Amino acid sequence: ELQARSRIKWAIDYITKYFFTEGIYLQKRQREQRLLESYRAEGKLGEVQCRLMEEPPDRLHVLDVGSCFNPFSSAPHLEVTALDLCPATEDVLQADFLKVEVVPGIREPELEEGSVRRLPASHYECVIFSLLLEYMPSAEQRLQCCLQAYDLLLPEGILVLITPDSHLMKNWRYSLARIGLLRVRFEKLPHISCMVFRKAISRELSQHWASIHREEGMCEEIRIPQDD
Numbered sequence: 168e169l170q171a172r173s174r175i176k177w178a179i180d181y182i183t184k185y186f187f188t189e190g191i192y193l194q195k196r197q198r199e200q201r202l203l204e205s206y207r208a209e210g211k212l213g214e215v216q217c218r219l220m221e222e223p224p225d226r227l228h229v230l231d232v233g234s235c236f237n238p239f240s241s242a243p244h245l246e247v248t249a250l251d252l253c254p255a256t257e258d259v260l261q262a263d264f265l266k267v268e269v270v271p272g273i274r275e276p277e278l279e280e281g282s283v284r285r286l287p288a289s290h291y292e293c294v295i296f297s298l299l300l301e302y303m304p305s306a307e308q309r310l311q312c313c314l315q316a317y318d319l320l321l322p323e324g325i326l327v328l329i330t331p332d333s334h335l336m337k338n339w340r341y342s343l344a345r346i347g348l349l350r351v352r353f354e355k356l357p358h359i360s361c362m363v364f365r366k367a368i369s370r371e372l373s374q375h376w377a378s379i380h381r382e383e384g385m386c387e388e389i390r391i392p393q394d395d
């Protein structure tokens with residue numbers, strides 16, 4: 168029995184609205200298509216390749232990284248693959264996410280010696296990093312995780328990012344835009360920030376947005392307060 172008003176219920180509700188009950192993936196699609204027209208009209212971008220999602224399937228492919236106990240798996244039409252460095256429950260796969268390869272053409276996790284080594288590229292409507300990134304040892308490795316999430320997501324799929332409290336979020340927005348993830352939601356919950364980043368229709372589009380909004384002194388990586 169999940170806690171109401173938790174990060175878990177927030178994410179389930181957002182995922183449902185984004186893919187089914189509010190068609191947010193289409194709203195943001197139109198927004199990105201307008202942004203691309205504006206950039207082309209200013210000569211800042213040429214013809215770029217766009218990749219669009221098809222109508223979402225009823226059962227969404229969801230990857231829960233750092234899952235611990237698979238809280239999302241009973242949520243309606245989420246087909247959850249849950250990974251954790253130290254699984255707490257038997258339905259969570261053991262994996263160090265930093266050592267996972269993203270492989271096109273496979274359709275399920277591939278394990279060696281009980282540890283996930285390979286995950287299907289461009290396969291998941293949604294990737295969830297709920298309180299995960301602050302356990303990574305470096306800002307480089309936090310970015311690495313999001314780069315892998317990018318390769319794992321279908322076009323217009325979403326990376327759900329939940330992180331504790333203690334701006335740095337402006338820099339995260341810039342750094343993720345640089346690699347093709349545009350932020351589409353930010354909400355404060357008790358003691359946490361809840362964010363969603365979308366695999367934009369075009370990586371080059373997102374890259375150019377990031378270029379326009381780069382501020383002095385902000386870095387490429389994903390820092391946390393305890394980087395000092």
Ligand SMILES: Nc1ncnc2c1ncn2[C@@H]1O[C@H](CSCC[C@H](N)C(=O)O)[C@@H](O)[C@H]1O
Nearest residue numbers: 233234235251252253262263264297298302
């Ligand atoms: N490199 C890594 N690869 C996979 N999981 C990792 C990891 N580093 C830390 N984790 C896991 O990430 C989890 C962070 S606690 C967050 C747990 C859960 N997602 C929640 O919302 O409460 C822990 O279970 C930890 O084991």
